Design a protein around this ligand. Sequence first.
Ligand SMILES: Cc1cn([C@H]2C[C@H](O)[C@@H](COP(=O)(O)OP(=O)(O)O[C@H]3O[C@H](CO)[C@@H](O)[C@H](O)[C@H]3O)O2)c(=O)[nH]c1=O
Ligand SMILES: Cc1cn([C@H]2C[C@H](O)[C@@H](COP(=O)(O)OP(=O)(O)O[C@H]3O[C@H](CO)[C@@H](O)[C@H](O)[C@H]3O)O2)c(=O)[nH]c1=O
Ligand SMILES: Cc1cn([C@H]2C[C@H](O)[C@@H](COP(=O)(O)OP(=O)(O)O[C@H]3O[C@H](CO)[C@@H](O)[C@H](O)[C@H]3O)O2)c(=O)[nH]c1=O
Ligand SMILES: Cc1cn([C@H]2C[C@H](O)[C@@H](COP(=O)(O)OP(=O)(O)O[C@H]3O[C@H](CO)[C@@H](O)[C@H](O)[C@H]3O)O2)c(=O)[nH]c1=O
Ligand SMILES: Cc1cn([C@H]2C[C@H](O)[C@@H](COP(=O)(O)OP(=O)(O)O[C@H]3O[C@H](CO)[C@@H](O)[C@H](O)[C@H]3O)O2)c(=O)[nH]c1=O
Ligand SMILES: Cc1cn([C@H]2C[C@H](O)[C@@H](COP(=O)(O)OP(=O)(O)O)O2)c(=O)[nH]c1=O
Ligand SMILES: Cc1cn([C@H]2C[C@H](O)[C@@H](COP(=O)(O)OP(=O)(O)O)O2)c(=O)[nH]c1=O
Ligand SMILES: Cc1cn([C@H]2C[C@H](O)[C@@H](COP(=O)(O)OP(=O)(O)O)O2)c(=O)[nH]c1=O
Ligand SMILES: [Cl-]
Ligand SMILES: [Mg+2]
Ligand SMILES: [Mg+2]
Ligand SMILES: [Mg+2]
Ligand SMILES: [Mg+2]
Ligand SMILES: [Mg+2]
Ligand code: NA
Lengths: 284, 279, 283, 286
Amino acid sequence: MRGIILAGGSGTRLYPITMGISKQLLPVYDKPMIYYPLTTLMMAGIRDIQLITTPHDAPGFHRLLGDGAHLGVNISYATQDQPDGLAQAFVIGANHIGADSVALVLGDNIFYGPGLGTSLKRFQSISGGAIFAYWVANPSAYGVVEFGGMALSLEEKPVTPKSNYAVPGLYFYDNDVIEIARGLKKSARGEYEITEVNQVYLNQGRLAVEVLARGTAWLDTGTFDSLLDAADFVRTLERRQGLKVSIPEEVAWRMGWIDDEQLVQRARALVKSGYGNYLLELLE
Amino acid sequence: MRGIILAGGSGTRLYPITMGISKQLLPVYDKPMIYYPLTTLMMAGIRDIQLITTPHDAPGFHRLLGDGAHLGVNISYATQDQPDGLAQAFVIGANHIGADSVALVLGDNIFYGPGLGTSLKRFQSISGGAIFAYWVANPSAYGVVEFGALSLEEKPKSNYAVPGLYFYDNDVIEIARGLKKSARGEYEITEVNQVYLNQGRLAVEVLARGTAWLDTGTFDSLLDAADFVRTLERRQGLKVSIPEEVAWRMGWIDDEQLVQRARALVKSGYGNYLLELLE
Amino acid sequence: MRGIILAGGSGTRLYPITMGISKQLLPVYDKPMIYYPLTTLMMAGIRDIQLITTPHDAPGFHRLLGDGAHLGVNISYATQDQPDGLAQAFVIGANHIGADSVALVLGDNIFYGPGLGTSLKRFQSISGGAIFAYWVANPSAYGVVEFGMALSLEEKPVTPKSNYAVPGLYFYDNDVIEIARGLKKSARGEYEITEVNQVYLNQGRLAVEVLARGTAWLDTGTFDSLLDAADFVRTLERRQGLKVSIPEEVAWRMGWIDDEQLVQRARALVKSGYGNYLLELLE
Amino acid sequence: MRGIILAGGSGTRLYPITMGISKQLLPVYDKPMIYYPLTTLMMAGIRDIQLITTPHDAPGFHRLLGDGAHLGVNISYATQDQPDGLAQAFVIGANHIGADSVALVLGDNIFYGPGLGTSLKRFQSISGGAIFAYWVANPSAYGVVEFGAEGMALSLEEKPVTPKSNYAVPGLYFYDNDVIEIARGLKKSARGEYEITEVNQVYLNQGRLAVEVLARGTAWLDTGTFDSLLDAADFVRTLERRQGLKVSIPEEVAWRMGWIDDEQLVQRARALVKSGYGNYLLELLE
Ligand SMILES: Cc1cn([C@H]2C[C@H](O)[C@@H](COP(=O)(O)OP(=O)(O)O[C@H]3O[C@H](CO)[C@@H](O)[C@H](O)[C@H]3O)O2)c(=O)[nH]c1=O
Ligand SMILES: Cc1cn([C@H]2C[C@H](O)[C@@H](COP(=O)(O)OP(=O)(O)O[C@H]3O[C@H](CO)[C@@H](O)[C@H](O)[C@H]3O)O2)c(=O)[nH]c1=O
Ligand SMILES: Cc1cn([C@H]2C[C@H](O)[C@@H](COP(=O)(O)OP(=O)(O)O[C@H]3O[C@H](CO)[C@@H](O)[C@H](O)[C@H]3O)O2)c(=O)[nH]c1=O
Ligand SMILES: Cc1cn([C@H]2C[C@H](O)[C@@H](COP(=O)(O)OP(=O)(O)O[C@H]3O[C@H](CO)[C@@H](O)[C@H](O)[C@H]3O)O2)c(=O)[nH]c1=O
Ligand SMILES: Cc1cn([C@H]2C[C@H](O)[C@@H](COP(=O)(O)OP(=O)(O)O[C@H]3O[C@H](CO)[C@@H](O)[C@H](O)[C@H]3O)O2)c(=O)[nH]c1=O
Ligand SMILES: Cc1cn([C@H]2C[C@H](O)[C@@H](COP(=O)(O)OP(=O)(O)O)O2)c(=O)[nH]c1=O
Ligand SMILES: Cc1cn([C@H]2C[C@H](O)[C@@H](COP(=O)(O)OP(=O)(O)O)O2)c(=O)[nH]c1=O
Ligand SMILES: Cc1cn([C@H]2C[C@H](O)[C@@H](COP(=O)(O)OP(=O)(O)O)O2)c(=O)[nH]c1=O
Ligand SMILES: [Cl-]
Ligand SMILES: [Mg+2]
Ligand SMILES: [Mg+2]
Ligand SMILES: [Mg+2]
Ligand SMILES: [Mg+2]
Ligand SMILES: [Mg+2]
Ligand code: NA
C-alpha cells in the first residue's frame, strides 16, 4: 500500500495566517501539522509516502522533511497547479501509487486513539474502499455518511444533514480508485470530490464504513478555533497523561525503521525545544 | 521615526516547528505572529517599517505583507544572512533609518494593554534611548533591569524583564557598529542599552498595571499566547493587534479600502470584524 | 442604598455537583463564587448586604462570610423556603431594604471591566430602575432586551429580538418592593425579575445601559460556563498580573479596613497563595 | 475487601474556597470531587464503602450520596474530630474493615487510564500492602518512593526536601487486615500527623510492600491547589470534548457491574436532566 498526504489547498479559512504559509506547516503545539497525517500513514505500515503540495509551498515541505530518510521512510513530492479537488490526489498521485492500494490522509487531519495507531495495518489488504464515521454536533461542515447499520448515502457539506456522522479525512482504497478518480467530472462547487469517489464504491457495494472507536479524537485544524483546540488537546495529553503523540521519529523507531544511534541523532538537534529530550527517554 | 522589526532568527527553541515555518509567521489565534510587533509600530504612528528576515523565509513575508500599501504603510524588507544578534538591526537597517530616530521591536513579542497603543506616538520625539520593564516570575529567561535605572544583564538583581521594544534617537547606528560580541557569541540589544545608560541617556518605564507582555518563543509560551488572545475575544469581545483596524483609525486607509480588506478575509471570519467596525 | 445577593436556588443545571453544595459556594479559580457578586456590591459602595440562601445551604455561607466585619461590611442573612423566583428578593428583603434604594446582584454572576468597579457608586442615587445589556451569541439562554431605547424584555425567548442579554445586576428605588409584592407567578411558575423590569419599563422609568467595550460578563450556571469563568480569571492573573474581585482589597481600598486588618486577612489565607497577593498590596 | 475514602481535612491550601465548601465537594468539570475516588473503589469491585468527613461538612455529603443505593453501594458515614493524619483512617475505620482487607483512597485524588479501571479488582486478594508510583517534576510536594538497582522499593519519605527519586506515591493504597494494628501502633510524625507513609514503611521493612509504577498513558491528579484543581477540570472536559468520554461516572460503573439495572439507570438519568449528565446516562442504554 502506498500513502498520499494531500497538503495543498489555499487555506482561505485561516486567512490571514495562511497568506504567509501553508496550513500544513502550522504548529500543533510542539510539531508541524504535517507530522500528524505523516505518522498516521507510518503507523499503518506505509513507508512510501507522497506529499501533494502547491508549487509555492513545496520548498517549505522540502526544508522540513527532505526525502524522509531521517524518519525511516521514502517521502516524495508532487505538485497540484490549483486546488481543484481532493479526488485529484489519485490522478496526480497515480505514478506514485502504481498498481498498489493506497491510503489518502488529509494534511489538516489529526487522528488519535484506539484503532488509530499500528492496528491501521489491518487496511493494507483493502478490497474496494474503506472510510470512517465520527459523530459531530455540526455535520453540515463536513462530508456526511448516513447509515440504515450499513451506509446509505453520502453528501459533501449538506445544508440538511441526514446524520450526525462526519466522514474524516482518512481513506483506504484498492487500485481501482485511480480510474474512478480520473473519470470524475467537476461538482457544482467546481471540484473533483472525494465524496463522489466514495459514492462510486458505494454504488458497487464495496464501500466499508467504520465508526471510529470509543475514546478516539478526530480533528480538522482548518479554522482558528479548531487549530487552537487541537494544540490544547495535544498539550493536555502530554501534561496529564505523559504522552507525546505523532512523533514520527518514535514511530519509525518502534516499527524498526531507524535504530537507536539514529534516534539519538535526531534528538540532539531538537534538544533546546524540549522535543529532543522526549526522544532520549525512549531509550532509558 | 522609522520602524524596524527583527523577524529572522533560527527559532531553535521551537524545533521542529521552525524547521518549516518562521517563528514570526506562527499563528497566534487569528493572525500571524508578525502582526503583533507590526501593529505596535503602527500604533506608535510609524509608517516606515523595515522587516529584517532570513533569506529563506522572506517569500512568506512578501506573500502576507507585500509593500504595506493595503495597511496604509511602507513595508520594506532587508536580509540577515546569519542570526548574529539583535543589534545588527541598526547596521543592516542604516539606509532605512537615515537621519531619523528609530523604534526596534522583536518579531516574537506581543504588547497588550494600557499605554501600549496609540499613546506610543509620544516616543517619536525621543532623545537618547527609552526602554521598558515588566515584572516576571522567571527573570532569568530575559534581559533584566535593576532600579535604584542601575544595571542591565542579558540572562538576577530584580524581577523586571526588559521586553523587546526599544526607542532610540539616530545615534544608535554608530553605537551598534561600535560593539563586539558576547560570551555566548551575539551582538546584544542589551549592550546598546548599556551604552545609552552609560551616557545617562536611557529612560526606563515600568509598563502599566494590567498590561500583558508575551514572548512566543517556546511551545508553552506560544500556546499560552494564543489562548490569551482568544480569551480576550470570547470573554471581553476584543480583537487585538488587527493592523487593518489601526490603519483605518489612523486615517491611513478609508472606509471602502477597509471594506475591500474585509471581503478578501471573509471565509475565515476575520473580515467580519472589519465590517463590524463600520456598523 | 442597601444590597441583596440572591444566593439560593436549586442549581439543577449543575447537577450532580450542586446536589452537594450551593452553586454560590463553588470555586472560580482562587475564590468562592459568592465573592464576585459580593465585591460588585462593595465596589458600588454598599456595606449592608443581605444574602438570601436556601435553608439547608446557609451553614456554608455562615462559615465563609460570618457577619462580614472582617471585610468592613455588615453581612446579614435570610432564607428562601423554596426557589419561587428572583423577585422574591424584594419581599424577603423588605425589612433589610426599609425605605432605601437597593441593588440586587445574582449569586452566579461575574462582572469584570470598565464601568464595573468603583464607578458603580453612581447608581446609589437611582430613581426608577437601572439595568444592563450585554451582547451574547446565544440570547435565548438569558433575559433579553431589544432596543429600537429599550423596546421589550423577555425571559429566555425562543426567537430573540436581539443579541442583548440582561445580566444579573439591577438597581432600583424603593418602589421595587411593592412592585414585587404585586407580582403573580409566570408561565414558568416563578416571580420573575424580568416582570419587575417590565413594570418600570411600562412607567418609562427603566434605564438600560449596554456594558462598556472590553467588559466581561459571565453566568456560571452550567458545567461549561463555570469552567470557562475559572479559566478567564486565571488568565487575567497569569497574563496581566491581575487578581479580580478580591473583597479584602476592595474593603482596604475603600478605607473600610486598615493596613493591620489587611495583614490579619493575609495571614489567615497564606497557605493557598491568596494571602500573598494581599501582602503584595501593602508593597 | 472494604473501602474507605478520606474526605475530611481542613483544605487550607485552597482557602478561601474551602472556608465555605469541603475540598471533596468541589466541582471537577461535570461532577463533584468525591465521585472520582468513589468510582475508583467501585471499579475495584468494592460495594461496602466508608466515607470519613469532618463533622461540619457531613451534611453536604449526605445530601449528595444519601444511602448510596442508587449507585448499588452501601455507604457508612464516619466523622474525624480533627484532621490528625491519613493513618487515622484505619482506626476510625477499624469496625468498618472488620477482618477484611481494605482499599484506602484519598478524597482529592483522580486516577485515570489503563490499569485504573475494573482491572483494579486484582487487588482484592492483597497480602501485605500495594501502592503506586507516578513520575512527577516536583516530587518534593508528595510522598516519594525510591527504587533500588533491582527495581524494588527501597525507601519512602513524605515530602522530602531532597527527593531520592521523581516518583510520587499517589493516594490509593491496598492492604491486608494487619493494617489496623499497624496504624494503631503509630506515633504522630514531625508534621504532627499519623502518616500513611509510615504505614507503608512498616510494610516495606517487613518485606511485604508491592509498588507498581502507573501504566504509560495514565493520569494521576491531586486537586488540592488552585492550579491543580483547575487543571483537573480542564483535563476532564478535554476528554469529553475531544475523545467523547465521560469518566468516573459512578452510575455507569454500577450499571456495568450489574449493581443497578436499566430502569434504575434511567431513573438516575431523569434526576439529572438539565445539566447534560443525565443525557450521557441515556446514551449508555443507546
Ligand atoms: C481542495 C483541496 C484541498 N487540499 C488540501 C488542504 C487540506 O489539507 C485537505 C482538505 O481540504 P479542506 O478545504 O480542508 O477540506 P474540508 O472542507 O476540511 O473538507 C474535507 O475534509 C473533511 C474532513 O476534514 C471531510 O469531511 C470532507 O468530506 C472533505 O471534503 O486537502 C489540497 O491539497 N488540494 C485541493 O484541491
Ligand atoms: C505506537 C505509537 C502510537 N501513537 C498513537 C497512535 C494512536 O493514536 C494511539 C494508539 O496507537 P497504538 O498503541 O499503536 O494502538 P492501536 O492502533 O489502537 O491498536 C490497539 O487497539 C486496537 C483497538 O482497541 C486493538 O485491536 C489492537 O490490538 C491494539 O494494539 O497512540 C503515537 O502517537 N506514537 C507512537 O509511537
Ligand atoms: C538573534 C536574532 C534574533 N532575531 C529575531 C528572533 C526574535 O523575533 C527576536 C529576538 O530573538 P530571540 O532569540 O527570540 O531572543 P530572546 O531570547 O527572546 O531574547 C531577546 O528578547 C527578549 C524579549 O522577548 C529580551 O528580554 C532579551 O533582552 C532579548 O535578548 O529577534 C533576528 O531576527 N535576528 C537575529 O540575529
Ligand atoms: C430561582 C431562584 C434562583 N436563585 C438564585 C440562583 C442564582 O444565583 C440566581 C439566578 O437563578 P438562575 O436559575 O441562575 O437564573 P438564570 O436562569 O441564569 O437567569 C436569571 O439570570 C440571568 C443572568 O444570569 C438573567 O439574564 C435572567 O433574566 C434571570 O432570570 O438566583 C435564588 O436565590 N432564588 C430563586 O428563587
Ligand atoms: C490530614 C487529613 C487529610 N484528610 C483528607 C484531605 C485529602 O482528601 C486527603 C489527603 O490530605 P492532603 O492534605 O491533600 O494530603 P497531601 O498533602 O496531598 O499528601 C497526601 O497525598 C499525596 C497524594 O495526593 C501523597 O503523595 C502523600 O504521601 C499524602 O500524605 O485526606 C482527612 O480526611 N483527614 C486528615 O486528617
Ligand atoms: C486603537 C487600538 C488599540 N489596540 C490595543 C493596543 C493596546 O494594547 C490597547 C490599548 O490601546 P489604546 O486604546 O490605543 O490605548 P493607549 O491610549 O493606552 O495607548 O489596545 C488594538 O489592539 N487595536 C486598536 O485598533
Ligand atoms: C478597585 C478594584 C477594581 N476591580 C475590578 C472591578 C472592575 O471589574 C475593574 C475596574 O474597576 P475600577 O478600576 O474601579 O474601574 P471603574 O471606574 O471602571 O468602575 O477592576 C477589582 O477586581 N478589584 C479592585 O480592588
Ligand atoms: C468501565 C469504566 C472505566 N472508566 C475509566 C476507568 C479508567 O480510568 C479507564 C480504563 O478502565 P477500564 O476500561 O475498566 O480498563 P482497565 O482494564 O485498564 O482497568 O476508564 C470510566 O471512566 N468509566 C467506566 O464506566
Ligand atoms: Cl440555580
Ligand atoms: Mg479541512
Ligand atoms: Mg524571543
Ligand atoms: Mg444563572
Ligand atoms: Mg459495616
Ligand atoms: Mg492532597
Ligand atoms: Na477479604
